[PDB]
Amino acid sequence: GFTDYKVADITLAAWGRRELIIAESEMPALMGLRRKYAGQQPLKGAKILGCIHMTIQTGVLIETLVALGAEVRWSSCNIFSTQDQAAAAIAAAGIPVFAWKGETEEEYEWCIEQTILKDGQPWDANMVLDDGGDLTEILHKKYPQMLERIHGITEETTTGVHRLLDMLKNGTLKVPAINVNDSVTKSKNDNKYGCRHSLNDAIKRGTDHLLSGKQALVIGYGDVGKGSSQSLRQEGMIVKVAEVDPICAMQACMDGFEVVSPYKNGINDGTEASIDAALLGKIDLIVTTTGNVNVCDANMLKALKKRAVVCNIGHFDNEIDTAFMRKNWAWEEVKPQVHKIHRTGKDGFDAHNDDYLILLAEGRLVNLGNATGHPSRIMDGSFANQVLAQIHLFEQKYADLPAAEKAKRLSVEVLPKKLDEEVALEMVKGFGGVVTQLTPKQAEYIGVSVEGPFKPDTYRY
Amino acid sequence: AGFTDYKVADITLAAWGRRELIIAESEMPALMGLRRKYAGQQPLKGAKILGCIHMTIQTGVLIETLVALGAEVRWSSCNIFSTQDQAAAAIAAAGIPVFAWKGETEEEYEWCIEQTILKDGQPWDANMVLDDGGDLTEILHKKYPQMLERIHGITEETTTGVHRLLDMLKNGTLKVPAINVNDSVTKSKNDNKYGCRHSLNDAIKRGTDHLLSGKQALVIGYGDVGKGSSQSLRQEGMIVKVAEVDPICAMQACMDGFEVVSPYKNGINDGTEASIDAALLGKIDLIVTTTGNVNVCDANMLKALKKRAVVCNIGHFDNEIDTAFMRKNWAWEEVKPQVHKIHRTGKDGFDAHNDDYLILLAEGRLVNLGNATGHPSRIMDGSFANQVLAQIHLFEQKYADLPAAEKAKRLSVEVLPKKLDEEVALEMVKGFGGVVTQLTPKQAEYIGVSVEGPFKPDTYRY
Amino acid sequence: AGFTDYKVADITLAAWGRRELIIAESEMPALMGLRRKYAGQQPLKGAKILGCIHMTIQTGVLIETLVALGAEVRWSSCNIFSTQDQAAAAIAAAGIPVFAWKGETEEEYEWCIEQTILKDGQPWDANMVLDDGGDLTEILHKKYPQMLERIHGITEETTTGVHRLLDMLKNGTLKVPAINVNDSVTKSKNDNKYGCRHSLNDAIKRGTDHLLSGKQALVIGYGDVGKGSSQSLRQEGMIVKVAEVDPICAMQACMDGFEVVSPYKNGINDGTEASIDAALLGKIDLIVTTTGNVNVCDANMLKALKKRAVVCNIGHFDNEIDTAFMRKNWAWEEVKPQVHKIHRTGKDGFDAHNDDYLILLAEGRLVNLGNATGHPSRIMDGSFANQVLAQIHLFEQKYADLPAAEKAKRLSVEVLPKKLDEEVALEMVKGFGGVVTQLTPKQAEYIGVSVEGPFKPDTYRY
Amino acid sequence: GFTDYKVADITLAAWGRRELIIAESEMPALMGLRRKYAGQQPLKGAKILGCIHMTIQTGVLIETLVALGAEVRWSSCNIFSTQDQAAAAIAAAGIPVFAWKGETEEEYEWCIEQTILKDGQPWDANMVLDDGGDLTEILHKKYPQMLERIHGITEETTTGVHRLLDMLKNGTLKVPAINVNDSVTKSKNDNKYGCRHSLNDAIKRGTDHLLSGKQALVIGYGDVGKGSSQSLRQEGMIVKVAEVDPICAMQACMDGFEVVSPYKNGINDGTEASIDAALLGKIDLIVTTTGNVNVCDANMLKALKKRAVVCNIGHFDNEIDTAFMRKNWAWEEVKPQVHKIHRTGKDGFDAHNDDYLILLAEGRLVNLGNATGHPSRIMDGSFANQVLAQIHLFEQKYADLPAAEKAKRLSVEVLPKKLDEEVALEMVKGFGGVVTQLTPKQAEYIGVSVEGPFKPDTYRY
């Protein structure tokens, strides 16, 4: 008689389970952790509030934490990223999960609250796993007392790490965190190659547009912008890249992309005259990858070529000024998560109007909203780090320290390189790759242990 | 004219060298931007720089930038095969002491470095060092330790040289501070990677004119040089396999679309022929070493390689390949300079029509510089703008004149501040005609940076 | 009003299908340009076209172009899994007879084709045929030969269908002329190649969501489909190996940077398990058949494949893979529609956690249409502009009205003239915003062409 | 005392011979024919006038023809394409060759005349091997009586085939020809992949310019244009393609290139007003690939970005209006086959002028002029076809046939597809590739012999 959950359709559980069994065969690092730690039950007594896209891959993450002793209460960190069959399989396993594809904003907030509260009272949570910082923020702002029992937060993504570092800088972070994002087997795997796999995937599912031969503008060239640009270039798009960081822009040039600004002289003065209208008027597809605000703004949207596709693969939908489009332009749903935005006005639209844009996932994370996000074998790296980070902070028992000791232990850190390498080795073996072993003479020659780590912490890969 | 303080292959190549220097200047906007920015201030007035780095056209623009900012220099190459003789000639013709030519012997290589250290039989009053690989740094510390008392710093170009500096610092044997120029992003992520992408397949074509498309390559290493090398070959249509000891680098190779293999069965290098994956090596048409390590293409691998395979090294030192084994056991047939057929049939003489040979490029020395011209000017622009900024910083710091307590606080091996890295990158981007967008105040506040940068924390890996 | 002459999955999907048709029209400038150019002339007035081709959104735009030019049509899909139900619904809601849905049984497939042939229980007075693969053409010749007496021509879409027509022509059993639409350059070297580049990786991702980067693929065939398929996988970072029986196609694979291998030791398929290269197949994560031939992924290959490899076919018919062997011997577990795990442990049930299975896509039917949506509109634009021109040409030639003696002289399988191929291509290029240069009179004289084209002799291969 | 030759430096012969021995190991199809036909001596009595780039690869061709029984007299078909060590090795082998890198136009014609004449009188030639048609034209226009004894021409390249078809159309072709160019193992190997290998090779050797991130315009997208565009795109250039053929342009789009015209709306009205100055002002590299005339014209050259590189990889230098540059602008030699063209005026230049273009090989075929042309393992296919073509026409004995039989055989034809396949099979095995053998049932299913041919003559590959 389990009822502590809410999903779209519990009868999808059997399908979800079939895809979970397949995903386990694609996630050797994560499954290897089940075997390595199962006997030791390192998460025995952990009670984890988790907030991250309720996909099949997150299902394998959840069942790994439970297999190692944890109790969890789960929600998705995006209104469109849940795979309903994954949520169903997790619920059917007796695990509290509150998540479905297509939540309203109000439902999204309610779902997080259902993880925080059990039977109307704060759950006795002692760990947090977060993707983007929304659950972290709610706890700090609305349930600060619960943080007195929490040993740490393990944060998945660049945006959530930024929010943690803001708190650390201001002295408002109440518990230590692991920056999972900046393991190399996360940032340079998930953020880059994951978007390479899933960006063109989502655009095809949403529009079925030919990409070869067409013009794309990618805003940003950090890890997601790099992966996104490659997702498009490898399909034969002519990709142009915009950046505010000259080092990232230099990489784009060397990688064979033309670097351009939406604005004359690169100066974003807020006027239509600033827009390079010739450039925007030839762009068939714009993708925002920045984690910044309004990098595809109203004047850019006004200038875009007719029938261009607009999408965002950064964490939050405010990269694109969708608010402007809601206020001024008529939205025509093609199918779920695909809207034609008619620039002729707000008072209805002509069904045969030619002056529209296609917006994907209403501006939300497009790879998860219009497809299934990153593939299992990539998420294997990210989520193996998550499990190790949960063990790392839980075994350190920060919440049991006195305030003076807490002050010394309060930090936002990445996992040690040795763990990063351990994850990477399992990933390589999953491809059938064979890593060479240094001879003692060679290890001595370059000043490393035969067991690693093989690089200093400053190395950038 | 009157000036005799140099040794180059042929001073009459100078005019040709000058024509190419003028072209290179137009390909190096960051470096020439610094030349124009600092010319009036002469920030290197009084600097006396010992330089040891490949005497290419690109190094020529670097040398003449340092001189234009007020420095005096004495130069040598850091590799026996990497000099461009017309570049050396143009520098010498400018009245600049330079001792370098393509095809030095080891003895002549050492002699050239000593000629920069000595002027008229006695130590020059040097006070700065620019090095690439650490050979000059090593000779100063071991044979001329007194000279380091007046030297304010070392600016070191490359991964191997930085490693040697960090070992000395840990041991307490480094006598002057250094700037690690290699680990600017506009160096490591530009020079080490994209430079080898440009120049590896370039050197293999000049040396052999072999078709690469459709053939099998094994790249040993997947750090920055191995990444660029692997791309240099894959973009030509090679089927590239990658070897690594570092599982994170191996993971990148897999995701980048390469099969990761080991020359040894199960990756175990126990020094026996039985450990060699002979089936694998018997299929490889080209092996490239990129590691900075020792003996990563060893005797047993060379014995097992497919007949007529090409063997080369793009790491700093030739000991990546066991060429000494090949000198001792096999007969070398020079095809043309820096290209040898190595006949595995025996030591004394060979059949001119023998089919069982390997082709070795540049005698195992850095192949891009040995068989072609190294990285192109527009890439070296980033590396060498960093060098100029590094020379200015350490010369103005005046380490050798500081009190002992201040010396102890500044005796380190450090990179340049990220703000300067970004300023070099901006000039490189403009050189492509790229346009960098400026953040609005709100956007800068939103991500927690200044509109002027720096745009990333120091931990950021790009 | 009272239209019931159709059968589709769900007529209430029509509004959705119409939304997607309106989008597709903006992606199909060559086809819509023909609709605008010929609509007033009504060149297909009086044409009654039996159509058998994948009932997709793209086919919807084709159907409504033919109708807009004056034709009546009766339509079915040429594959049991390729219909898009919202496309079929939109066409039915427009009052056009269509009999098609995704997931037909073989019996239903045949019934749908017969519903186009028969109207109210009697042969429709058809006078034109548009086919993809030859199934409708075969049924007419075998079962309804009297209907062919009134048919002016067949316009055939695909390589396999063209092969079947040429067999009939050489055997003296072809009853009406055909236009080989496949071998327009704007079809074969657009649709067959780039279409599969777009849609093969698309279908694999939708069916499995597997990471492709770093994994091993074997592509059987390197014709136009095999070329596009190999690129679909290589651009994702797969390590792709290619098999071929044609040495010229194999030469291209090598030069394109693929390793060319055979499933069989030394390429010799003697029918025994012993001839299988078990080491090779035990490394393969994905096999794709692209040949139009029979049993190119056979029972012994399936037995040797790496555990959990994906198996799929993008050639026209499912007999490229020996699925019958798998139905007879192994247990099938449906993951979701058109995705099956085939458990090699036995036929009678399976362990849900068994690790020894293959994943078969679309039950071995055309995978890009079965697990995704086939080629994109802007590619199908070229193919279907050729179809419309071909229909116009054969309809206006009125073969069925000729005396027997003249029929004999007119019976042929021909391609469209190059000038029309070029005109289709020009509209495609304009759709990308490309700008074609016009020859000066002197340049056209210099190379021996008219300024307006055709620009190449008929022998040119592009 | 063999002295019937003219080369730059006979002392280079040992070096040339070392490189020929290497090249033999890279040319399995050509060397396979040499070993296969040595016993039969099918060219015994053949006296071949040869005119084709005197490279190491041509050396292996020459020695194969001689090994099969032919006598030859040889010249290069371009003033810059000879490898002097290849010429020296051939001369030191006792074979008449008149060729060096850097001939004048007058010397170029002298070298061809030296092959035609022996001891001051027409040689008793009976076969022609040509590349570009210059030797063919000299024979038809200046030595027509010699064609009475000649059995055929085997023509290497697109431009030369065009000239043969013009002569055939006009009734002026006096002997039959095999179009070697349009074997698939030539046209779709040499013309495309050869330029892919050797275009960026030659630009690097001439300029050492970084190509990544820079803007290129390739004029033409036939086989040479396809291979050239790939040569630049694989280095990271942003490549734009121009074409007059919309089918070739369609391919360029699908291959991921932006298709543009130097002229507004594609219309060249001969004036500067028709030039897309904005486009050409952004181009760093222009490469002509057309076989046409004046496709990089004076107004384009005036509008190009300062310091742009200009080169031609089509057969003849008139693709670029170098005549205009010689008349109006000052040429500064950087090094052999590399000139700065100073647009400041005709009479002298400032050594530090910034307004110049870099011209490679004085507009002559750049891959052969500034590098070594195609690699041996590509030229293997072309030159195997050459040997088969020489054998076929020599054995047909056209010169001896009665007039009515000549009429039936006066044609320009390709080799049979079976031979094309057999060349390709040897090339594939040179890579270690393994071709699968059809079963009898499969051969019956697709209607081919197990031995091939596998495709109808209409197939385009």
Ligand SMILES: NC(=O)c1ccc[n+]([C@@H]2O[C@H](COP(=O)([O-])OP(=O)(O)OC[C@H]3O[C@@H](n4cnc5c(N)ncnc54)[C@H](O)[C@@H]3O)[C@@H](O)[C@H]2O)c1
């Ligand atoms: N959708 C996914 O699956 C996924 C995966 C990982 C991360 N993310 C999210 O994507 C975003 C980016 O992540 P990241 O790791 O690439 O971060 P990053 O810091 O590496 O890169 C973002 C880049 O955007 C650039 N940028 C900022 N403002 C800009 C502007 N106005 N114009 C142009 N460029 C601008 C910055 O210079 C920076 O290089 C974050 O929100 C992160 O959480 C999404």
Ligand SMILES: NC(=O)c1ccc[n+]([C@@H]2O[C@H](COP(=O)([O-])OP(=O)(O)OC[C@H]3O[C@@H](n4cnc5c(N)ncnc54)[C@H](O)[C@@H]3O)[C@@H](O)[C@H]2O)c1
């Ligand atoms: N030729 C050039 O122009 C050029 C340019 C830059 C640097 N370099 C030199 O190239 C070398 C590599 O530089 P880098 O920046 O790439 O260093 P790096 O530390 O980034 O990469 C070297 C890689 O080699 C790997 N490796 C070590 N031993 C190995 C073994 N036995 N088998 C396989 N892989 C092994 C390491 O794991 C590492 O990833 C250095 O010597 C550097 O000075 C040359």
Ligand SMILES: NC(=O)c1ccc[n+]([C@@H]2O[C@H](COP(=O)([O-])OP(=O)(O)OC[C@H]3O[C@@H](n4cnc5c(N)ncnc54)[C@H](O)[C@@H]3O)[C@@H](O)[C@H]2O)c1
């Ligand atoms: N799914 C799609 O959207 C789509 C699109 C176009 C065509 N097709 C179909 O795909 C098939 C291939 O069409 P195509 O145009 O590429 O034909 P093609 O003739 O160009 O190529 C087929 C290739 O298969 C090779 N082959 C034959 N038997 C082989 C064997 N046993 N092993 C290895 N290689 C073998 C042949 O040598 C040939 O090169 C046909 O059935 C065609 O109708 C499908």
Ligand SMILES: NC(=O)c1ccc[n+]([C@@H]2O[C@H](COP(=O)([O-])OP(=O)(O)OC[C@H]3O[C@@H](n4cnc5c(N)ncnc54)[C@H](O)[C@@H]3O)[C@@H](O)[C@H]2O)c1
């Ligand atoms: N350098 C080499 O090694 C090499 C190798 C093979 C052929 N070639 C020569 O290169 C030239 C091209 O050969 P190909 O086989 O590619 O011929 P091709 O006929 O296949 O291609 C030439 C292309 O140029 C296009 N073209 C013509 N005029 C044009 C114009 N004004 N603007 C734009 N495009 C235009 C044509 O439409 C055509 O597609 C010939 O001269 C051939 O002899 C050189």
Ligand SMILES: Nc1ncnc2[nH]cnc12
């Ligand atoms: N498939 C996925 N599951 C969970 N988080 C993700 N982030 C990106 N892709 C994801």
Ligand SMILES: Nc1ncnc2[nH]cnc12
């Ligand atoms: N290397 C080469 N030798 C002869 N002819 C060629 N045409 C192109 N490259 C060539």
Ligand SMILES: [K+]
């Ligand atoms: K997924």
Ligand SMILES: [K+]
């Ligand atoms: K250089």
Ligand SMILES: [K+]
């Ligand atoms: K589609």
Ligand SMILES: [K+]
């Ligand atoms: K060559």
